[PDB]
Symmetry: C2
Subunit: 202 residues, 2 copies
């Protein structure tokens, strides 16, 4: 179990590193005051949180007894902080032995006071408090199978609704065309993943 | 301009209504403790915020003088609250004359005390405070043109990096395959929109 978990964290870390690069590019090379830039930042932040959660789940699936220190290093605290755009001068003022696992364990008043000691902004504290709540909520082929099937049904219904409201127009709005492309793509990704899960279950 | 802005708000509202339905389904028909469910909820919340901001931009691009009350009704405050999963018992305890435009005008202490008086949770107050900050940051064909071109370059680089790290594998991880599909799709959506913007800028 430890070998499989460490391999998965390493794969997840490649996605994280790529995504952190793209997030920095959106934040520095794009117009941040633009509503599409903001949508894409939020979407990439969401993927990074998912990848970080999956690394943590991989580490916790192993019984605690001597899961290799390489395995215990995932997820990386700096990756999570960078996901929520914590200023790098604040990351440098963070204690070395402090981990995301510790933040999850403290109460809300202690989290905020710890962030303030590092110089975190009031805007930065609410980000991480919200992030810990979204993180804590999350912390199985058949359970993944059922959930993916519900998500396919909703995605099919979303596409049908979009087509009902905008289909067959000769000057379709760009904002509709973006949703059409994304959701028909999402349906194909989900249907593919469902086949992967039905095989794993079978 | 009032006619065009109202028409755009109407199109945007159709996307909002559809998206609110899908968000409710994710929250009620799916496993909310699942990390893919959470990603998809976050992604739909992001689109909803974008649609609401675009409605607000449409209303504000028109000079204020007698823009029709139908136009002034966008965005709808309940749509924004539902996007951040505010409990309906809290929505009912919200004053009628209270608008999203007013919350944007208040200081942080005023926002929190107003939310608390409606019975909002501590998790709901920080959620909406975070939402107002993300909202306030946002609140033009050539500016859209330039931004899309930067986003295309990053999307292309993201795909190239995905293929560098995972391309040519015989058992590719599902999580990679999901990213590959999404980003190659996103590149096609961006490049199509770039064509549309280059046409509008041209004329």
């Amino acid at each position: 179990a430890a070998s499989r978990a460490l391999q998965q964290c390493g794969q997840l870390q490649k996605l994280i590193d790529i995504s952190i690069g793209s997030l920095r590019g959106l934040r520095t090379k794009c117009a941040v005051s633009n509503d599409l830039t903001q949508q894409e930042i939020r979407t990439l932040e969401a993927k990074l949180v998912r990848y970080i959660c999956k690394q943590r789940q991989c580490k916790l699936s192993v019984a605690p007894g001597e899961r290799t220190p390489e395995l215990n290093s995932y997820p990386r605290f700096s990756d999570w902080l960078y996901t929520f755009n914590v200023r790098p001068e604040v990351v440098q003022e963070i204690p070395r032995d402090l981990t995301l696992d510790a933040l999850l364990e403290m109460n809300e008043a202690k989290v905020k006071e710890t962030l303030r000691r590092c110089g975190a902004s009031g805007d930065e504290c609410g980000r991480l408090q919200y992030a810990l709540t979204c993180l804590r909520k999350v912390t199985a082929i058949p359970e993944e199978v059922w959930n993916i099937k519900q998500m396919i049904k909703l995605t099919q219904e979303h596409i049908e609704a979009l087509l009902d409201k905008f289909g067959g127009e000769h000057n379709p709005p760009s904002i509709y065309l973006e949703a059409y492309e994304e959701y028909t793509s999402k349906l194909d990704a989900l249907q593919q993943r469902e086949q992967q899960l039905l095989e794993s279950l079978g």
